[PDB]
Structure formats: structure tokens, C-alpha cells
Amino acid sequence: SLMSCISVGTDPMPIITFLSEWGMEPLEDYVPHQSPDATRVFVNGVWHGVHRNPARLMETLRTLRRKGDINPEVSMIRDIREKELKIFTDAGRVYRPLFIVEDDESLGHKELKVRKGHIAKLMATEYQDEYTWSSLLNEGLVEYIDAEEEESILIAMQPEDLEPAEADVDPAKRIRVSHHATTFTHCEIHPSMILGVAASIIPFPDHNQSPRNTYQSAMGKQAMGVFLTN
Amino acid sequence: GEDDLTFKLADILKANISLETLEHNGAPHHAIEEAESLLQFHVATYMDNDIAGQPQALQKSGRPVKSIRARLKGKEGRIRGNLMGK
Amino acid sequence: DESAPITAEDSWAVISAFFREKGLVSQQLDSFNQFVDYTLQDIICEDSTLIISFGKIYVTKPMVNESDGVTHALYPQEARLRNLTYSSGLFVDVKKKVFIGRLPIMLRSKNCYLSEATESDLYKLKECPFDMGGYFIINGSEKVLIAQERSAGNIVQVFKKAAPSPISHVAEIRSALEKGSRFISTLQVKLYGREGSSARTIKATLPYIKQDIPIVIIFRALGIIPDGEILEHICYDVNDWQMLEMLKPCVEDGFVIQDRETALDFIGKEKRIQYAKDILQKEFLPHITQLEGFESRKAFFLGYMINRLLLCALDRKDQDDRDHFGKKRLDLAGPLLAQLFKTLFKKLTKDIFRYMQRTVELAINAKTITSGLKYALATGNWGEQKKAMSSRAGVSQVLNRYTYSS
Amino acid sequence: AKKKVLDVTKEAQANLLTAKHGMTLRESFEDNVVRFLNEARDKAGRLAEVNLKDLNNVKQMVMAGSKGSFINIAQMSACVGQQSVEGKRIAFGFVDRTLPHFSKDDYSPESKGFVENSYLRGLTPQEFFFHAMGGREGLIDTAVKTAETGYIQRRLVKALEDIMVHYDNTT
Amino acid sequence: PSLTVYLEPGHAADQEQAKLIRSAIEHTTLKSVTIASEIYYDPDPRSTVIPEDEEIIQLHFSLQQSPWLLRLELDRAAMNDKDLTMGQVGERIKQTFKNDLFVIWSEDNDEKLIIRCRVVAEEDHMLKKIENTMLENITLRGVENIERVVM
Amino acid sequence: TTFRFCRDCNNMLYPREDKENNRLLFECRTCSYVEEAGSPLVYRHELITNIGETAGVVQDIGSDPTLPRSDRECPKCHSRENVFFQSQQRRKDTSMVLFFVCLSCSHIFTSDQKNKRTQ
Ligand SMILES: [Zn+2]
Ligand SMILES: [Zn+2]
User: Fold this and answer.
1) Distance from the CA of A161 to the center of ligand 2, in angstroms?
2) For the CA atoms of C356, C361, C362, C364, what is the dihedral angle to 10 degrees?
3) Distance between CA E89 and CA E72 in Å, rounded?
4) CB spacing of D103 vs A151 below 8 angstroms
5) Calpha distance A50→C304 (Å, rounded)
6) Are C234 and C306 in contact (CB under 8 A)?
7) Do residues C326 and A93 lie in contact, with contact meaning Cβ atoms separated by under 8 Å?
8) Which positions 11-50 of E are in contact with C (Cβ < 8 Å)?
9) Closest Cα to residue A71, out of C34, C17, C174, C116?
10) What's the CATH code, domain C154-321?
11) Domains in chain F: how many in total?
12) Are C212 and C167 in contact (CB under 8 A)?
């Protein structure tokens, strides 16, 4: 797709040496039954031990990432219903980017941490052609969520429509379901980004038999134009 | 630039001579059957080259070699490729 | 209000920002960067040192070497018209500073003059600004290294097997050390006896071992002699009589052993009893560690496997969806080269030998690397020359210049 | 047609569903839901098809039969329909759900892959995506079918070459 | 590999007549009707250390061996789908091994159908070979290969 | 069958018979230990299995957002914060009943209407 990217390969130890100092009970001295709620911790496919109350071990890593202390690439997943902590660094993980919703809005329900000020503060840097992308990342307002860590999360399609309350509707428009949930971990920048170069050019692909767009994305390759200017 | 086949024959010929010359000179009795197999190999790998007895009888450069048989073998070859469709 | 909501349109601006810093080729680039900066160095330092050492490594920007001439500072546009190879010199501080092959650099990467340059600056170079790089320039033509998807590594997966077979279920784990030789030995934890038949025994296969082995023998071989303790490595809740029951028939299998001595024995006297120690160190679940003092961490896993293994024979967890993206890796530019650089850099090291082994008393055919890398990115036939197609046919293609989009 | 589904939804979440010769309760659940939505499309269209005056080009190409089927009318002006993969509507690749934009264990239609909009209004992220998975299917059993098809075709042919009606009227 | 079979002339719309033959074809094995197999230590062939089993024994004595017991509870629901009767069942098991394995069995009225039996120098080991030989090589009603069948 | 292992040489326990006294004994084929039977039940081969299960809630099953919420009311606490699912028995034939959960007590209450479960 457009937004998608790929892991490059970070290093473990700065997370390993980080963990065993925040809860993890080395596997050398593990005793099964003594700990049933044992949410054994995993990293890059290895069992480096276990850890009791993980609720915190988690939101500690998450905010450790969202600051830039743990490479925003790296993925960590909590399989609660199986008591497992999946943490990855691996080089080759396709991953997109999303808006975070953390309901930590003492002035109402759940809401996108990003706000209209962050944006105008962006279009401001647009006009000058200091507030990059690397800013929305180190200011934890968006995260890089892979496929695995996508399993354990919820996502809003639209930032608007899928947020406010329900207190008429166009007879022309399409028909989108609803917002029957208040758990939204993240939100989608824009759906369009599920597409790839090819399709991205098709106008209204959302108005054609799926196969038509599949062909058109095999011909815009046989067409002509200006492949460069030199 | 000669043809593969012309080469095998060559090797078959080479191999052949080196064998004969061993029964009219210092014939180390059972050091011969060590080159009689070479003949058999070439004289065999010439007609067929896709056997179970692994050695593909490669020709310098990694080029497999074109066994006579290899020519008739269906589709793209003599019988089905030149005759049934020209 | 610098803290209000965000409508639809608003999203876009953020995306603009996404590419501003990223650009439609992010991936392709970064991977190379990484390979160059770090990775590059790590490879050189491993089985390097000989019976001579290798220190840091320098990466010079593109240059050219021609007779009847000095050494021109090379650029893109030129290598393309002259049918050159936008490569760069590789120097490494050897220890008894030194030239060691050429690394075909990727346009727009860190070593390509294009990275830093600006609009106008470019035109003077003839390089169209709109060009986004991300490719290579081999023997003239624009070659591309294509994303190679594959089954992720170092993970445990369980699979059901065909009705017509002695094996019921299986748990697999592909073990490959992140850095160093990169051994690819698989660990098989089977499960004989289908659903119903008596004696559903759990056996597993180890590298360099012709037969299979009952998880028990292994377990005792790992220094865990007392059963039930073993069962403590397999069952994490004694109020799970189903799974427990399941192992009974198994323990019964290894009963012909009762101490770590014999355990390693039936893995082939005195001679064989050694062979096994190594295998269980360097080849057994080789990821995690091959060192020594960790028999415990290993066992716990072998168990974590078996546990998972049965959880399926007991309809508690479906089989493992082989096609879950989060378990698919896309080997890009860097990684790919990486591979090459290793296998190559070794043929060099094992040829540096041939100079000393003849010194009854300057020996570095840097061409090996330089040529190799070309061949590969040239054709696409990775794994190398000689008498073998050995490689994966189809990597590294010729960029498409049909349209900008395309 | 959604409630006529919802009804059968709880009526199965409350264990009040006749297994039916249809084997498996769950299996027997679907066969009712699907059959309920399809029944709706075909018919949702049977409405437009009859409301399109005898001066509507599309209909005309259909009447003359030069090109087009009434289906093509539905899917354009009424409603696309429920997509599919091996029969079983959109599955759960996403551990007990379809897209991460969904709540675990949601068996409702808008998630098992039902495109409610007409090609005229235009699918939604989700609709669009499933729809895809759905179409992209043919494009596959065509990549493999093509592999064996050929071989059959030849064999038959290579088997009955010499067979011709002789002069005695024998064969 | 299916195969469709039509009834005999008249016998057509005879609904019931259907299953009557279903169970006359669809391969049925003890293993299909069992709910468990248990090996017990009962040395007194004149009383079972098991409560629920009493009443049975008492009946087979009013109207040598081994102390190793093998008890098989069966499914009722599975004895009608494909018609069957305790008698038949065991009756078969008995003419399966013949004179060299004592067998007994509750009555079609007991809330728990069962089948007790003992052998006749390692008794347990041999009393497991006969544990399998009792589940997979033993037929009841039907033809081999033909699993499921329907109307 | 909840079987057992010995002491000191902790392994598997195999049964043997006390001829003279007519009774059941377990044992060690490694050591020498021997202990009296616990029950006359030496083995069970359950073929048909009736399984209607719920999933072990790690208790943080209120933090996992992937689940849906309901406004019903538990049998005891009467709260209105739930989060259901289904029988983690990845079996085909399984039914489609719901197992909710109270976030203010931790009670597993079905919506069934035939059978009755306390487990
Ligand atoms: Zn003991
Ligand atoms: Zn409650």
C-alpha cells in the first residue's frame, strides 16, 4: 500500500536488559503452579522468562515507545486470554501507521490525541515551501502497528463520523454502519491508503466490480507518458 | 562454432583411444576397467543425459549437454515440435 | 482552539507530512542504509580473524578506475550512459587501510550524492529531480531488488496432518540465528497415533539425527530425569487431567531410561555420548542460544511446544493459519545483499588462507566480491557462480521506465 | 432483511435453533442468514428492474439481449450483494472477527461480508475490501484450472485422432 | 465414493422402513457405541467393588477365571439411531473370542448399560490387546467401508 | 484417574497385585517403594465427550478492547458492564451461546435456555 513500510531490524538487549528490571522473573528460576496467572514473556521468538501483573508492564512499554525510547518500529502484543507477551524486533515486518485514540480526555469520552492545533501547526510548515512527521511520532500522536499487533486492537474508520454521540440522513449517499463501541484504540488516517500505486490512480474504484480495478492496475503499466524529464 | 553432439563423440572417441592404447601397452589389469566405464559413460551419456545416476556429464561452463534423446522429447522438440507442428 | 476535534479533510495534511519525510520509496532505501551503516560491519566481524584480524570498515562514495587516467569521482547519470556500475570502494583496517571489493550503492541512499543535493543542483547533474531513486545501476542498466516474502522465523506453529498418515499433529519452529552463519535447522515435535488408536506417543526430530526421539528421552537428556517434574515442564495446571492423561502413554515410552547418562547415550560408547551434547547445544532449538548453561531455558520451550501441540489435539485451539501476514517476512534490499556479502566474504577469507598456507617464508583478490555482487544484481541469480543454478531465479529486475507511476 | 437475520442471530445465541438436517448448528445458522440476504438482493433489485421505464438504455440492451442481465441492473442501481470465499461468507483471519475495525465475535452481515450499497452509491472501506477478496477468487481458479485444462484437452484429442466414420458406416 | 441405493418395490414411502435398512448397511462398530473402557481390580467374581454394578452380577449367577476386569459403558442414544440390543452386542463380543473370555451385561432397562468381563503370567498386558481387538476389529450391524449413510 | 508418583525417586507409578491379601498396589520400577491403591479405577478411555466451555479470564478481560460490551445485568452484582464471547472450544459442532463477564465481580453468566452451568 502507500502508507505501509517495513521493519529494518532493531536490537533486543536494550529491551531485554530493560525488562528483567521491571518485573520479568528469569526462566532459570521458574515454578509452574506457583504462578498460574503466569503471562510468560516473549521477545523475537524467545522465552526470556515470565512476569506477574502485566497490565502495567504493558502500558509502560507502550509509552516507552511513544516517546522514542523503544524504536517505534518494534512491535509488542499482549495476548491476555492466553497469558502471553509477544515482543518483536524482527527485520521484515510490514506495518502501517495510525492515529491513537487514548480516551485520556478528562473533558469527555474517548478521543484522538491529535488535535486541530497539531494540524494547523503542520500546514504551517507546508506554507514554508520544523514540525515534521518524526514529530507526530516522538510526540506519541500516531504509531506504527504491524499485522500481528493489529490483531489486539480496535480501529475507527473515520476520525469524525465514528466518534460523537447519537442525539435526516442524505437519500443519495451510501450507507455506513455505526459506531457501536467505545474501545477504539486507534483510527485510520484515511482508508484510501489500503491501495497501491496502481489503483491510487483509478477514480472512484469504489464504484466498480472489484475485478475491473484489478485489470486497470495492469495497464496503466502499458500506457505512455513522461517517465522522467531528463 | 561446433555442435554439442560433435563434442561428445569427440570425448567418446578420446576415451575410446585411451582405452585401446591400454591393452597394447603396460596393461595394469584392473586399472583399465577404470576407463572402460568412462567409455560406457560417454557412449551412454551421449544418447541420454537425464538419468537417475546423477552425474549430468556437464560440459565446461555448467552447460548440461544435449543428449540425442533430449532432442525428440516432446514439445519444443523433434517429434512434437518440428513434425506435428511446423 | 489548539485542542479541538479533527474533521475529514484534516487527515490528509497529516499524510502529506507522511511522505514529506518518507517518500514513496522509504522501504527500499532504509533497508540499504541499514545494511551499509550497521549490518555491513557486523558481517565482517564474526568468523573473520584467522590462524590476522579485521577492524572497522570504510564506505567511500562512488568513484571510477580506468587505465590512462587518475580516478574520477563518479555519479549516476554518467554510469548509466557509460554503462558503468554505481559502486563504491570498500576499505577495512586489516591487522598483521585495505581495498576489498566494490559495493554497488543504491541511488538516493546515504552514499549517493543525490541524497544531499537540491533541485537546481540536480539538473546540472542531468538527473531528473522527479526521479525517486531506490534502485541500482549495474553494468549500465537500472536494476531493482524485489521484495522477497517468506515464512517468518523462530516461531512455533502447530499443524494437523492428512488422514492417511501415522502422524496426527505437529508443532514446527524454524530456527535461524539472527547474526552469524545463519543455520536453518527445523525442530519437529510430532504426535504419532491418530485420533483413537492406543499409544498416542509424542516424538520429535533433531538435526543430524536419523531417527526421531520421544520428548522424554530428550527431556532427561536435558538434565530433567524425574518425570512429573517433566510434566511440570509440560503441564502448567494440574487441574487439566485431559492433557495430563495424554502424556501418560508417553512417559511409558521413555521408561527404558532413568538418568542423564543414558539419555544422551540413545542419541547415536563414550564416542556417541559426546556427539549428542554438541547437537543439543549448537543444533537443538539453536535460536535462544547455543552456548551451554541453559538446559533449563531450552527444556521449558520444548515443553511450550508440546503444550501448544496438544492444545490442538484437544480441540482447544484451531490449527495455525499459515497465511497470517504478521508471520510473513519481506526480505528487502539490504537483507538480500547481506546474505550475499556473507557467503562471499567467506570465500575471500578461505582464500586469504591459501596465501599463508603456501608462505614457506598483496594476496587479496578483492575482485571476488566486486564481481560477485555484480553477477547477482546483474542477472538475479543470487546464490552465486560455478556449476549450479543454485540461486533463486528472478531477483533484481530492470526498473520499469514506462511511465512515472509505473 | 437484517432483522430477519438478527432474529435468527439471538435465536441462536439463546440455543433455540433446530439443528436441522443441515448438520451442525452453526452450519445450519449460516444457511439461514445467507439465504436471507441473497433473497433480499435478488428481490431488492426485482424492484429497480421493474421501475426502470421501457426507455432505459441498459434495460434495452438487456431486452434485445445484446448485452446485460438483470443482475447487472441490481448490482448497479439496487445493491451489490454478499461476497464469498469457498462459499462460507468472509471468514475470521482476524482472530474471531473480520477487520480490526470490528468487535470480536460479531456475526452480523456487515462483517461476514455483505455489500449493501449499489455500485452507484459506492462501497465502503470494509465493503470494498471484502468485495475484493471475493472477486480475486475467480482470477485464481483460472490460474490453476488453466494448468490442467490444457492437458485434458490434448489427451482426449490425442486419444481419438484416428477415429473416423468409414465407408461401411462403421466407426 | 458414494453409492445411492433404492428400496425394494412396494417398500417405498415407508418412512420407518428406511432406518430399518439404514442400520442394516451403515457399518457399525463397538467403538461407535461405547462411551468408555475401564480396567478395574475386581477379584471377587461374585461382587463388584462398584456400586452401580451390583444388581447386574446378582442376575447372572442365579440362572478358574481372572481378577482383572474390563468394563464398557455404552451410549443409549447410539443404540436406537442404529437399532440394537445389549443381548446382540455382547452376544457378538462373546462369539468373537468364544470359549476363553467371560462376559456379562446389564439389561435394556438399566439407566446405565454396561459390559463386564475377565480373561481366563501377565494379565494386564494381554487385557489391552483385547482392549483394541474389541474396538476396531469388531463389527455389529452393517457392511465394511460404508461409513455414514442417509435417507 | 488422578494418578500419582512416589517420593524420593519421583517417577511413574505402575500397579501390581497383592495375591495373598487380595488388594491393589502401585509402585516404582526404578526404586523399590510401594503404596496402597487409592481406588479400584485403573483406567478410563472416554470416547464420546460432552464439552461446553468458557475461557479462563485472566481478570484483565476488561482491558482487552477487541471485545464487545453489553448492557445486561448479572445474577448477583447487577452491574451493567459486560464483555462476551464464545466457547473457546475450536470445535465445529459447538453451539453459539454467549459467556458474558462482570467487570465489577468476575462472574461467568450464560444466556442459555435449556442447560444450566456453574462452571
Ligand atoms: Zn519411586
Ligand atoms: Zn456481577
Assistant:
1) 33
2) 0
3) 11
4) no
5) 13
6) yes
7) yes
8) 31
9) C34
10) 3.90.1110.10
11) 2
12) no
